[PDB]
Design a protein around this ligand. Structure first.
Ligand SMILES: OC[C@H]1O[C@@H](O[C@H]2[C@H](O)[C@@H](O)[C@H](O)O[C@@H]2CO)[C@H](O)[C@@H](O)[C@H]1O
Ligand SMILES: OC[C@H]1O[C@@H](O[C@H]2[C@H](O)[C@@H](O)[C@H](O)O[C@@H]2CO)[C@H](O)[C@@H](O)[C@H]1O
Lengths: 167, 166
């Protein structure tokens, strides 16, 4: 059945989900601040990650102000970072809303749709499949583009399909 | 296409959705405050409403501190309120989180599942069916349990049509 779980993630920490995020599920990270002028990343200012039980980075959303880009990538816990998908102009993706923001990730089975506020910035074809068992928000107090603590809200058990058969 | 929409709603106003909420979709109201000591409503302290395209009150979630109850109901805009569904102990529903709150409504087609924070408060069997085309948040400045402005986020286009060819 459908359920809502709330997690308050401090910068530099991660949490295990009470209910895994799977195909048809949604997770939204809410930030109470938007620091588009934060310190220089190294090279990341902020990273939002969806982890598989084996620690694989199912999806990482990395924000880089200096390089002015949002990187989407995946990799096994002991494997190399895979093919990066980039979105230029970090500020433009958040335009329209200041002092706060939200990043939503839809798990569509074959792809991860990421939406910054109301704007879909990418339909990311998965490079690694599997259910998300933990989330993380990594950054330092001085260079994060988001608030010290980011609230993650997962909407699980959502999957709804209408099967139409033909022959 | 699945999509997220954000609407800031001031107490006593309503908003027209850019994308309607239908079966399988979600709408969550976020409050930057929680005032469970706001006093008696008139009779409601706060009401969250989902309106169908034809103007009907698909669902009203009404909080009453003096009655210590949450009332769920429906009605036609020119008609009488229908059969009230009640859930007692308002505080218990928001237990665990202070200074803020979220109310989530899942549209399951035949029923609306209301969730306060992480707790499912009710599986409301619909008295009126249809797609939600607008929302409203009514309350006064002094007696609302939520912040002056509530932020509603909709997740739409979620149901999927899966064709199989044999
Ligand atoms: O791909 C995510 C991953 O990127 C690393 O930095 C990459 C850099 O983006 C790429 O252009 C370069 O060729 O290789 C670097 C890694 O050696 C980040 O260091 C890492 O934290 C992730 O963000
Ligand atoms: O049902 C929501 C609706 O309730 C109205 O008040 C009701 C009251 O709760 C009920 O016990 C009584 O029998 O009828 C009243 C209506 O005549 C509120 O006035 C209305 O705003 C909604 O909150």
């Amino acid at each position: 059945m459908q359920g809502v779980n709330i997690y308050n993630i401090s910068a530099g920490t991660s949490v295990d989900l009470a209910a895994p995020v799977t195909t048809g599920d949604i997770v939204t990270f809410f930030s109470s601040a938007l620091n588009l002028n934060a310190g220089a990343g190294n090279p990341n200012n902020t990273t939002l990650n969806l982890f598989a039980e084996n620690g694989a980075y199912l999806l990482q959303i990395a924000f880089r102000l200096q390089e002015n880009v949002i990187i989407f990538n995946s990799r096994q816990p002991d494997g190399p970072w895979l093919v990066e998908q980039r979105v230029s102009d970090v500020a433009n993706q958040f335009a329209g809303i200041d002092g706060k923001a939200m990043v939503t990730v839809f798990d569509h089975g074959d792809k991860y749709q990421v939406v910054i506020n109301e704007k879909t910035v990418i339909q990311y074809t998965k490079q690694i499949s599997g259910l998300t068992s933990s989330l993380s928000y990594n950054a330092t107090e001085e260079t994060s583009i988001f608030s010290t603590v980011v609230e993650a809200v997962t909407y699980t058990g959502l999957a709804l399909e209408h099967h139409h058969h033909h022959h």
